[PDB]
Amino acid sequence: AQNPNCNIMIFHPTKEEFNDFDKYIAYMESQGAHRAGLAKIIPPKEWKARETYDNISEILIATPLQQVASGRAGVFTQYHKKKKAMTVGEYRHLANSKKYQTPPHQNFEDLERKYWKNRIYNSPIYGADISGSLFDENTKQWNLGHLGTIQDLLEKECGVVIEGVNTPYLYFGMWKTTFAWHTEDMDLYSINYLHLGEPKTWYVVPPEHGQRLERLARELFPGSSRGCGAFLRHKVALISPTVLKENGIPFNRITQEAGEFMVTFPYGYHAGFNHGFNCAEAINFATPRWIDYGKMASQCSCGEARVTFSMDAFVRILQPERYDLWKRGQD
Numbered sequence: 001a002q003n004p005n006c007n008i009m010i011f012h013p014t015k016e017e018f019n020d021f022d023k024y025i026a027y028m029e030s031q032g033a034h035r036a037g038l039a040k041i042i043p044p045k046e047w048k049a050r051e052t053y054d055n056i057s058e059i060l061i062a063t064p065l066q067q068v069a070s071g072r073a074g075v076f077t078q079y080h081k082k083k084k085a086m087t088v089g090e091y092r093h094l095a096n097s098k099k100y101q102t103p104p105h106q107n108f109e110d111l112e113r114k115y116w117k118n119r120i121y122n123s124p125i126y127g128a129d130i131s132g133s134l135f136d137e138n139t140k141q142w143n144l145g146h147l148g149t150i151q152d153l154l155e156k157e158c159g160v161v162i163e164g165v166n167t168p169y170l171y172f173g174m175w176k177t178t179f180a181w182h183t184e185d186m187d188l189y190s191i192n193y194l195h196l197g198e199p200k201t202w203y204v205v206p207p208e209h210g211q212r213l214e215r216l217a218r219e220l221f222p223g224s225s226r227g228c229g230a231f232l233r234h235k236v237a238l239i240s241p242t243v244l245k246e247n248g249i250p251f252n253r254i255t256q257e258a259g260e261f262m263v264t265f266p267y268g269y270h271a272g273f274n275h276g277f278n279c280a281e282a283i284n285f286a287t288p289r290w291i292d293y294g295k296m297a298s299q300c301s302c303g304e305a306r307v308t309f310s311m312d313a314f315v316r317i318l319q320p321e322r323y324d325l326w327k328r329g330q331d
Ligand SMILES: O=C(O)CNC(=O)C(=O)O
Pocket: 171, 178, 179, 190, 191, 192, 264, 270, 280, 282, 283
């Protein structure tokens, strides 16, 4: 069995290997990359996402989110308070202000220490989940706006044509902006490209051990767990690496820098934080190997998780027994 310790693998495809996206994912899996739940892909030196980032300041962040924490430093939830619209130029200036800017630090490990010690005492503002793309239309390789759709994959594997669309999302971050522990909708893959700015630190639990994280989370968030049998779908719970280690949960960590891709694999729980002002693009995708994960994915039906239009068909075709109850949650 390849990668039996479930380590995060880093890949350096050549320009020739970067042509065929599906083939390269399957290659990474042949080497055991999926066992970690997360892989890093460094593009060939010949590749670029677009020519420059000099002209992005007028993008609108219609609903910036202030991430307010509750709990203790290593075990907390966050809620998202909606703020007034602002441009990416306005958000960048806010991120660099004395109130929000990255503190002085020695290295990524010092900054990680500072994150976990102090995150709860601040409320950073995240520009998340903005439909759009920063890839140039002429970028032919690993262009996250031109990937094969999940609807087309389901149709190719299973024979059933379904409604829905699959487009990317932009994320504008600042110091301490946080992504809570989650797997993707319907335990899909995700791919994330860090276009510009400061790094993003990731934590990940191997898919084979995801239920260990779930059991810990039920213990640590006992009210939330009574409310919903899949409350990590709400994307609000944080658990620190120190707490994970104290409870014997297998995990790994890695820092993504500008110009690098990360892929998350089906049922790979992940969480993390941004180091300073940055912009990332991400989208969900599927392969043949996803189908079995999609059929078994948990679902939130309490009403909280509320998701995209295209999840309807995935539930309806892959999980017809759950469909009625899940759809009640959506209405
Ligand atoms: O970058 C973020 O805030 C969160 N991203 C992801 O969870 C992802 O790409 O799957």
